[PDB]
Amino acid sequence: LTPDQQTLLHFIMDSYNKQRMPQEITNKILKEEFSAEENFLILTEMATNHVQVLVEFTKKLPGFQTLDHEDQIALLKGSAVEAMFLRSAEIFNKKLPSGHSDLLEERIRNSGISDEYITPMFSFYKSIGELKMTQEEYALLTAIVILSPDRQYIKDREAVEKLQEPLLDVLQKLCKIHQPENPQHFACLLGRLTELRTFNHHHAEMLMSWRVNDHKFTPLLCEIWDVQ
Amino acid sequence: DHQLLRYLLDK
Ligand SMILES: CC(C)c1onc(-c2c(Cl)cccc2Cl)c1COc1ccc(-c2ccc3[nH]c(C(=O)O)cc3c2)cc1
């Protein structure tokens, strides 16, 4: 835990900790009626608000602002779902209070989402949870997930990579040192990053279905996910 | 373009 790193994380957990999501909004997961229609309206609201929170959080990441303006957008579009899946997964596993996990689960399970997609998404939640990830880990991955250079329609992969590389290292250290019990923890964590990617096809297809069954998202969501 | 995202960043 070098001083270069031991404070850098505190900046990051400082960001990750900022209670961006409005209680007034999340509360609707609990208080509103439960139906296919209402469930879907509720989830869009959370997701669109979350997209705002991610863009806020993403800014506060180190050396993000020094990035290419055109470049910056491609990371957000690509990493938006994976980031969203991380927090949503974080909720169920960690049973966050603002999460309303049980009731959030009910909504999701009756949002007009197919079983093909519902089964795996919920497998992922279970498995990632059994990992017993710390808050440190969650926030750190989210950062790693956002900066992944492999993301499509990018040019300056190296510039992001430098921004990313420090973070991978801090985790590499943290999991092994905090968890010498096993050294495969880094392997497990990064393994999931692959697992997340599986949902980008899943999610593109979920949007397609919703669309065709006359659901409509927000101007913000449509933009980030490239919805006609 | 991607007008909304850009505004979000600068905002
Ligand atoms: C309905 C549409 C917009 C949708 O499409 N795919 C997904 C979708 C689905 Cl189900 C699952 C996973 C990913 C996506 Cl991207 C969604 C809904 O996604 C979200 C579901 C819940 C939350 C959520 C709810 C409560 C929260 N509290 C806090 C907090 O910090 O307090 C964060 C937070 C986020 C965000 C997005």
Coordinates of N, CA, C and O in Angstrom, one line a residue, chain A residues 55 64 72-73 77 219-220 223-224 226, chain B residues 1-10:
Chain A
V55 N -21.8 9.4 -14.6 CA -21.2 10.5 -15.3 C -20.5 11.4 -14.3 O -19.5 12.0 -14.6
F64 N -9.2 11.6 -15.6 CA -10.3 11.4 -16.5 C -10.5 12.7 -17.4 O -10.7 12.6 -18.6
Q72 N -13.8 10.4 -24.5 CA -14.5 10.3 -23.2 C -15.9 9.7 -23.4 O -16.3 8.9 -22.5
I73 N -16.5 10.1 -24.4 CA -17.9 9.6 -24.7 C -18.0 8.1 -25.0 O -18.9 7.5 -24.6
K77 N -20.5 5.3 -23.2 CA -21.4 4.5 -23.9 C -21.2 3.0 -23.7 O -22.1 2.2 -23.5
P219 N -34.4 10.6 -22.8 CA -33.5 11.1 -23.8 C -32.1 10.8 -23.5 O -31.3 10.5 -24.4
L220 N -31.8 10.8 -22.2 CA -30.4 10.4 -21.8 C -30.1 8.9 -22.0 O -29.0 8.6 -22.5
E223 N -29.6 8.1 -25.7 CA -28.3 8.6 -26.2 C -27.2 7.7 -25.9 O -26.4 7.4 -26.7
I224 N -27.0 7.3 -24.6 CA -25.9 6.5 -24.1 C -26.0 5.1 -24.7 O -24.9 4.5 -25.1
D226 N -27.6 4.3 -27.5 CA -27.8 4.4 -29.0 C -29.2 3.8 -29.4 O -29.3 3.0 -30.3
Chain B
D1 N -24.7 14.1 -33.2 CA -23.8 14.1 -32.0 C -24.4 13.4 -30.8 O -25.3 12.6 -30.9
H2 N -23.7 13.6 -29.7 CA -24.2 13.1 -28.4 C -24.3 14.2 -27.4 O -23.5 14.3 -26.4
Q3 N -25.2 15.1 -27.7 CA -25.4 16.4 -27.1 C -25.5 16.3 -25.6 O -25.0 17.1 -24.8
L4 N -26.4 15.4 -25.1 CA -26.7 15.3 -23.7 C -25.6 14.9 -22.8 O -25.4 15.4 -21.7
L5 N -24.8 13.9 -23.2 CA -23.7 13.4 -22.4 C -22.6 14.5 -22.2 O -22.2 14.7 -21.1
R6 N -22.3 15.2 -23.3 CA -21.3 16.3 -23.3 C -21.7 17.4 -22.3 O -20.9 17.9 -21.6
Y7 N -23.0 17.7 -22.3 CA -23.5 18.8 -21.5 C -23.4 18.3 -20.0 O -23.0 19.1 -19.1
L8 N -23.6 17.0 -19.8 CA -23.5 16.4 -18.5 C -22.1 16.6 -17.9 O -21.9 16.9 -16.7
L9 N -21.1 16.3 -18.7 CA -19.7 16.4 -18.3 C -19.3 17.9 -18.0 O -18.8 18.1 -16.9
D10 N -19.6 18.8 -18.9 CA -19.3 20.2 -18.7 C -20.1 20.8 -17.5 O -19.6 21.6 -16.8

